[model samples]
Target: MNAVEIISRDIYKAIDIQTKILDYMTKFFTDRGFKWLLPIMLSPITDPLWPDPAGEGIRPAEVDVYGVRMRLTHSMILHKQLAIAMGLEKIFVLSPNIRLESRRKDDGRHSYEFTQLDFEIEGAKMKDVMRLIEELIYGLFRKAEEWTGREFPRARHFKVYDYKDILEEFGSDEKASMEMEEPFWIVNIPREFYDREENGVWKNYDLILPYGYGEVSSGGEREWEYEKIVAKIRAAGLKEDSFRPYLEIARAGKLKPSAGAGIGVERLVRFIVGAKHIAEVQPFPRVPGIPAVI
Candidate 1:
């Protein structure tokens, strides 16, 4: 069947499953006292999390909001950080994001438009964040099985690996996912913003799903110190001036030390429904390189 036909056949089920997922997620956080924030769709700054090896030409979707230049939200990373700093112990937002991906990079798992279930916790460690995700995934799958009447695999003691070690063995994240038979964690990522240095590695993890689903979530502890963040920004080949607002918060010692995660909603739904492509779960998917139908 074509994309449209498949969507027609599965859209109802997809929406039902997605609604359940959101409901579960909301309860999961609310029970723990996490605030639900309405995400900002436009901002002066968003996540610059992409590690573009091509060097410094990456651009997010840009707009002019009444004479002020703004960017379409790419990820809620910065906002989550700021929110946690504002005295909230925890928070979550289902955020819509846009990334103008290239045509050649339009793999089935990628979309120009996607939604992220982003959450953060103030004063949380890496292990604390990992434990939260592990329990959340286990609970989510159990609930999904009940809702859909389909048995799903459960993860116990999700395997953890150093990021460099995985790359060294599998050559890439995609290859690592394909080779793994169960869900795993790739930790100690070298992202400049993740952390300063602990034995020459940054504090971060990418939660990978088995059956070649690649990354389900990426998160870790953040750098909250003013000077440290400034140094890391420069180290990432980013001008500190561009992120003045974020830096200013740090400079005032208001930014909290936090750990957070961003999970791709469509990807999570795709796995639950045994969909072969990520687009299967998206009713109006904006696949990269494809013209919009709406």
Candidate 2:
């Protein structure tokens, strides 16, 4: 087959598998009383995953919307917390995000634009959400195999590691990925927004796949207290004014204790399909530094 014909065929099959996976995940959550939420594409604030390391110019995609500076969603972390506070106890958004990555934009797996199955559960512990994710992953594996009539590789049981322990043993995330031969979960991540901490370890986790494919999913308990959130923002060297709306809500004292996670849709597809790169699974791939075709 020609390149066009082969790609078209692959895209069709990928879409089929993607649809089946989404169905399984949606049912799994919805049956358990989770609400599916509409995505927030533009906002005044987003997940400031990119802390200004050099103190300048590191920010998410921004657009001027009706004379207001709005940013493309990077992750719905802020929105998830606010939504949960508004009384949506269990919620999920198949959120599309646009990130302006400084490096690895051309890497096969690092796309500038992607989608994540972001969800939140109010009044839940981090462990509770982790267990739910474990079940969801196993369920997807079974559903994918049945739908595709092909066996999908799955770890018999996912191993768990503390973030510090993993780093101590493997030296780096790259080494951890290289050493681990099966899917594993790394907890106690030290991200700025993960919030709660014990013995200096944050209460967060990252689900990493085998074969050197790092971080497929991440989530954890969030900071609900107004002062705590402010402290975290300042600690990350960010201006508190940029997050005024979120702080206002936090101060309203309506924010609830919640934990949640986001799984990259394309990354999950790549894992299931055993594709060499993330671009292979995306129908209209958007690699950083490369102009997208349609």
Candidate 3:
């Protein structure tokens, strides 16, 4: 299955579905008074994503631009916080992230590069973001059905589970998702330095897609306080050097409390269209272990 593939009718079908998804998502946020920030592919410093087990397969992808080395955006998590602190209050970006995942974990869902719909709201909690996602999912399903003249998953209440419970009961999130017929949440997932922790609760969550699709979105309340963020970073054994710009803003007490999540655009499309692999939905696919073709 390492062979190259030409874009087929199915790919076009998926793209058409994805087009509607993006349209509805943009309208949903903007109508809610959310600022749609422009996306930047290269940045001075992007998300470190350190110590997150999900990031274990990630390999750094860098570019030297005019003597300034810039890393490809992993996600706009840091930038979203900056914009919020600057009084944007509600912001979202359609960001392109290049994770350069190792070939070892070349599952159907693994992509070296992908697009994410990232958004944040200042002073929001995990529950706030979760509700917004639920609404967005239902709206997209309705739009997909209308556009394709095909039935989509009927809207229903999404199940919720704690991260530890998932591990203990189902052995892993992957197994847990396979058993789910509807979208669900696995909360308190231990992740990067940014996810907030209070009163011994991690406060982060991953929205697992239904029918073994795995995680479609992940985020939580952000650690915005200067001292708290620094402590979290240090506790994760991460280098403050790679994250100085973000840390500097926090040190100045300019970072605002916020919560947000980034949903994988291709993953969402794949789930919607019931694609066999993530590459099916992306025109210029960059899946792990496969040579990228333009």
**Best candidate per TM-score, number?**
3
Q: lDDT (CA) for every model shown?
A: 0.80, 0.78, 0.84
lDDT of 3 by residue, 1-294 (tens): 333555443477788788888988889999999999998888888887776867673545788999988888888889999999889999999988878777875767778888889999999998889898989988887877788777776765477899889999999888988988778999987778888988779888898887888989999999888888877778877777878888889999898889999988889888888887887787777878677756
lDDT tens digits, residues 1-294, model 1?
A: 455664565478887888989888889989999999998989898777545321134478889999988988878788888898888889999888787777765656777888888899999889998999998988998898898888776775598999878879998777888888777999987764645356677778779888788888888888888887777778778777667788888899998888888888888888888787787788787877776574
| Candidate 2 lDDT by residue in tens digits, 1-294 | 334644564577677778877887788889999999999989998888744221124478889999999989878899999899789899998999887665544545577799899999998887888888888887788877887677754754588898778879998666788677767888877666435655677778788877777778888888888888787778877888888898888898978888999988888887777777787777777777666655
Model 2: lDDT of residue 217: 86
Q: Using lDDT as the measure, which candidate wins? A: 3
For all predicted structures, in order, the TM-scores are 0.92, 0.90, 0.94
Q: Where is model 1 more than 4 Å wrong at Cα?
A: 1-9, 52-57, 192-196
- RMSD of candidate 1 to the truth, in angstroms, is 2.5
Query: Quick one: ranking by TM-score, best first?
Result: 3, 1, 2
lDDT of 3 at 138: 80
TM-score of 3: 0.94
Instruction: For residue 141, give model 1's deviation from the true position in Å.
Output: 1.4
Q: Pairs clashing in candidate 2?
A: none
Clashing pairs in 1: none
Of 1 and 3, which scores higher on TM-score?
A: 3
Sort the predicted structures by lDDT, highest score first.
3, 1, 2
